[PDB]
Design a protein around this nucleic acid. Structure first.
Ligand SMILES: Nc1ccn([C@H]2C[C@H](O)[C@@H](COP(=O)(O)O)O2)c(=O)n1
Ligand SMILES: Nc1ccn([C@H]2C[C@H](O)[C@@H](COP(=O)(O)O)O2)c(=O)n1
Ligand SMILES: Nc1ccn([C@H]2C[C@H](O)[C@@H](COP(=O)(O)O)O2)c(=O)n1
Ligand SMILES: Nc1ccn([C@H]2C[C@H](O)[C@@H](COP(=O)(O)O)O2)c(=O)n1
Ligand SMILES: Nc1ccn([C@H]2C[C@H](O)[C@@H](COP(=O)(O)O)O2)c(=O)n1
Ligand SMILES: Nc1ccn([C@H]2C[C@H](O)[C@@H](COP(=O)(O)O)O2)c(=O)n1
Ligand SMILES: Nc1ccn([C@H]2C[C@H](O)[C@@H](COP(=O)(O)O)O2)c(=O)n1
Ligand SMILES: Nc1ccn([C@H]2C[C@H](O)[C@@H](COP(=O)(O)O)O2)c(=O)n1
Ligand SMILES: Nc1ccn([C@H]2C[C@H](O)[C@@H](COP(=O)(O)O)O2)c(=O)n1
Ligand SMILES: Nc1ccn([C@H]2C[C@H](O)[C@@H](COP(=O)(O)O)O2)c(=O)n1
Ligand SMILES: Nc1ccn([C@H]2C[C@H](O)[C@@H](COP(=O)(O)O)O2)c(=O)n1
Ligand SMILES: Nc1ccn([C@H]2C[C@H](O)[C@@H](COP(=O)(O)O)O2)c(=O)n1
Lengths: 422, 26, 422, 26
DNA sequence: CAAA
DNA sequence: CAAA
DNA sequence: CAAA
DNA sequence: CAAA
């Protein structure tokens, strides 16, 4: 059992809303993996001074090769020195089209499946809304321009419109009645049954959550889910550079630039696999076009304003449209919110005047205003919404430079032992 | 979140030997 | 969280070599299951006095319904009150043809899959020789008379002939050579490679064992294996009943009759499933027809007798036939043993005279002497080999009566709460 | 392995109530 | 035994 | 039970 | 640096 | 995070 120093530095960059891999390391069953990443994160030069900080999220997952390669892997390992070589997957014939999984597309335009499948699995088990279509892309070449290079899009920071109730949420439960009578005992079960359905719809869409519900547990191997080993996050701040020449004097450019550590406590790697670490930069969804729900309603009813408890706990959800939340709110986008939820949270305010001011990372256009009457598309972060405020994405929206200190104890003959025959 | 003002990265530098090349090479 | 008393008694019986289920209890994710089984085990009346005791083995496994029902289960659970009802499997149109899984074939000749699949899984993951064909029987009706009623056969207690080296064991490794030269560096890898192959052949045929080999681990969910919760065992002794009448005076009948406890420490049931407990009675494979290997060899060589270390550690295995171990040893049965293994173990002796004495649980006929030149068939316990010594299998070879005290804490409304509407 | 000489089994007998039948039944 |  |  |  |  000896130390293998896999420390290495990395220079990266990506688009706002998209999730990018920043460092992946292959591990072996028996490995004791430790990772201390430290460095600084920045964003392409801004147009004006600094407005608000971006929330940066770093993740480190562990994925058994078995999760990727399936039973085909168990054999690979079982057959040992005979095993049918594991198949690789395909990327498009472009260098960058492998980015989402932290690597340049190799000479042969094909990268190892575990990189690709892991990225998916990670995305489907933690980043997409449980109700959104599960990402299934077979190969890195079924991926489109933006995705393959920048990573999949993730959800905006949770707020009233970005974190609604799953669209298929029941708004009424019908129960069969005879013609002149009703089974009150049936009506009973009816409700109970509804309950089980809601419990699920609301927060138990994933198998594990259902089991946990009974007060049980589930190995990560049960539903084949990446293992979240470590998750840190922080706010990216910086400074303004002052203009000093005849015409620039009195102008300011914001240079976001935050240092940070992302430490992963010693971890025991039970089976051969990959340790993937990804980042995700986002800006809180501030919009000069959003207003308090109550300022929007035209006919203010008791059931709205009053905030009568008796009601708030027994009414069904409420279907409202983005129109109800933004002046330019797309009306075709319907979201189901919880009653009087506008009394459980206050929205951020931006004087309209910032509306057309190039340079602030605000949503100067009602969310999903150019994706169509599609909710999911509105909820996921459209990185173009930001092209506006950057002086020049020569390094995309953001970028970072960090040193990844990695120490791994493992059964490994010494290089000498490898090169020496006798 | 770490306070400090951004520092440039240094060396990619441990266990036993890795590079056998015939003798000493700087 | 309340106590549910599932204590219950059971009266059973079965054939010698076969593995029978004695008590299965369904559990729910969240259940805390505890089992204390106590009772006595006996064997049908013997012909003569008692000769030797039988080793009784009790097992208690836990099998998630997920292992049985597959992804089809995850949905069942996910869909909740909608889920497509789980399918049952088929048994033959006979009451007893469900025995192996502790139950009378229900009115509709179909029992729940988890019972059947679990029995398989248990059998394939712990009872069959790793090299023997994996049991795959789809439904309890693909099972034959004996099996379905008595349980699958298991392996005789390990000895020189019942526990040989996997039949496909390498006896020589060939390596490609040019015409006048040999790559000594290749010859090197060649050996190494062989090693990995042997390591596997010998004791790493199962995926888990391979991983463990690297110094890793594997959830029971990794290779979908039953979880061995508890395993006890004991020797079944009893007494002789003396003959007292004119002709019986001086005769004796052996009444094996051993009491026993089989306790299972509190166990946390993470997912809905089954707790199955099975038993296995066997007699040590004593035969008046077996002899010391060395007494058999005709030409005693140094390499045999000497026991020279230098040799014993570097020679390849040895192929010998049952003929070499029994007088009536079937010569078509070839087993590969380890060199000088006859010096690492001494065989049991029975004066031939007991050869044709009805009443002793010995193998009065060389193992697998009526199954043909098939090794596996010789190794597995043929229960007919014993019909000979029992006065009357009115309750098969053995039988037992025990009380299974079971206490389970679980989220469970009270019967009142179930029957009361308001 | 338990010493004792084989005893016949008794009652199949705890938590809360199970059998509601209208009143007391022996 | 309203395990009210 | 790699008596690795 | 024979991580001999 | 069933603020079960
Ligand atoms: C800790 C802080 C440093 O970035 C990291 C490596 O330090 P060194 O100096 O190269 O470990
Ligand atoms: C709790 C509130 C914070 O989001 C979370 C991490 O805090 P920290 O500060 O990074 O824990
Ligand atoms: C090293 C020390 C530990 O026994 C072994 C496995 O550690 P873990 O904790 O299960 O690796
Ligand atoms: C570093 C520079 C040197 O070549 C190498 C070995 O140094 P030493 O002096 O033998 O390590
Ligand atoms: C312990 C010994 C007993 O068999 C078991 C049940 O006892 P009770 O008496 O029915 O618990
Ligand atoms: C060790 C040797 C024994 O087989 C095993 C169990 O012993 P006990 O006596 O039942 O543990
Ligand atoms: C009960 C007490 C425990 O928290 C819960 C799970 O126990 P286990 O040990 O993981 O069930
Ligand atoms: C047992 C016998 C009785 O019917 C039952 C309740 O007894 P109690 O007396 O109400 O429990
Ligand atoms: C429990 C059941 C009822 O809700 C409450 C009253 O208890 P007792 O039964 O009166 O306690
Ligand atoms: C003995 C056998 C091996 O040579 C050495 C290693 O032991 P363990 O088995 O890892 O000790
Ligand atoms: C280790 C490698 C060799 O087997 C042994 C001798 O060490 P040094 O290097 O002389 O120790
Ligand atoms: C509060 C909500 C439920 O009524 C009760 C149970 O809490 P926990 O959640 O299990 O407490």
């Amino acid at each position: 059992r000896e130390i293998v120093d896999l420390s290495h530095l990395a220079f990266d960059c990506g688009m706002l809303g998209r999730l990018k891999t920043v460092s992946w390391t292959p591990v072996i069953a028996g490995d004791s993996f430790e990772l201390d990443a430290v460095g600084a994160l920045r964003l392409s030069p801004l147009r004006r001074g600094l407005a608000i900080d971006s929330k940066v999220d770093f993740f480190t997952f562990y994925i058994p090769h078995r999760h990727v390669y399936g039973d085909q892997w168990i054999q690979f390992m079982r057959d040992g020195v005979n095993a049918q070589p594991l198949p690789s997957v395909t990327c498009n014939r472009y260098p960058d089209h492998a980015g989402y999984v932290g690597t340049i597309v190799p000479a042969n335009n094909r990268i190892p499946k575990f990189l690709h499948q892991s990225y998916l699995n990670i995305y489907n088990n933690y980043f997409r809304a449980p109700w959104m279509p599960e990402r299934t892309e077979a190969n890195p070449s079924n991926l489109n321009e933006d995705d393959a290079r920048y990573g999949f899009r993730c959800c905006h920071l949770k707020n009233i419109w970005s974190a609604p109730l799953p669209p298929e949420t029941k708004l009424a439960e019908e129960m069969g009645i005879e013609s002149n009578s009703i089974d009150i005992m049936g009506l009973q079960a009816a409700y109970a049954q509804l309950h089980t359905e809601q419990e699920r719809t609301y927060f138990m869409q994933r198998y594990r959550d259902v089991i946990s519900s009974f007060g049980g547990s589930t190995s990560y191997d049960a539903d084949n889910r990446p293992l979240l080993v470590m998750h840190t996050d922080f706010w990216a701040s910086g400074y303004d550079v002052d203009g000093t020449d005849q015409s620039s004097l009195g102008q300011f450019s914001g240079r976001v630039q935050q240092t940070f550590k992302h430490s992963v406590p010693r971890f025991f790697v039970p089976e051969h696999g990959v340790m993937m670490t990804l980042a995700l930069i986002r800006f809180p969804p501030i919009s000069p076009l959003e207003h308090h729900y109550l300022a929007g309603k035209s006919q203010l009813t008791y059931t709205d304003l009053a905030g009568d408890p008796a009601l708030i706990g027994n009414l069904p959800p409420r279907e409202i449209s983005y129109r109800d939340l933004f002046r330019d709110g797309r009306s075709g986008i319907k979201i189901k919110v919880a009653e009087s939820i506008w009394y459980r949270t206050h929205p951020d305010y931006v004087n309209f005047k910032y509306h057309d001011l190039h340079g602030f990372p605000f949503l100067d256009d009602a969310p999903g205003t150019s994706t169509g009457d599609n909710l999911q598309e509105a909820i996921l972060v459209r990185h173009q919404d930001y092209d506006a405020c950057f002086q020049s994405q020569q390094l995309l929206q953001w970028n970072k430079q960090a040193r990844y200190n990695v120490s791994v104890y493992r059964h490994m003959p010494t290089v000498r032992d490898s090169i020496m025959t006798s | 979140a770490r306070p400090g003002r951004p520092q440039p990265l240094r060396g990619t530098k441990k266990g036993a030997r890795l590079w056998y090349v015939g003798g000493q090479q700087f």
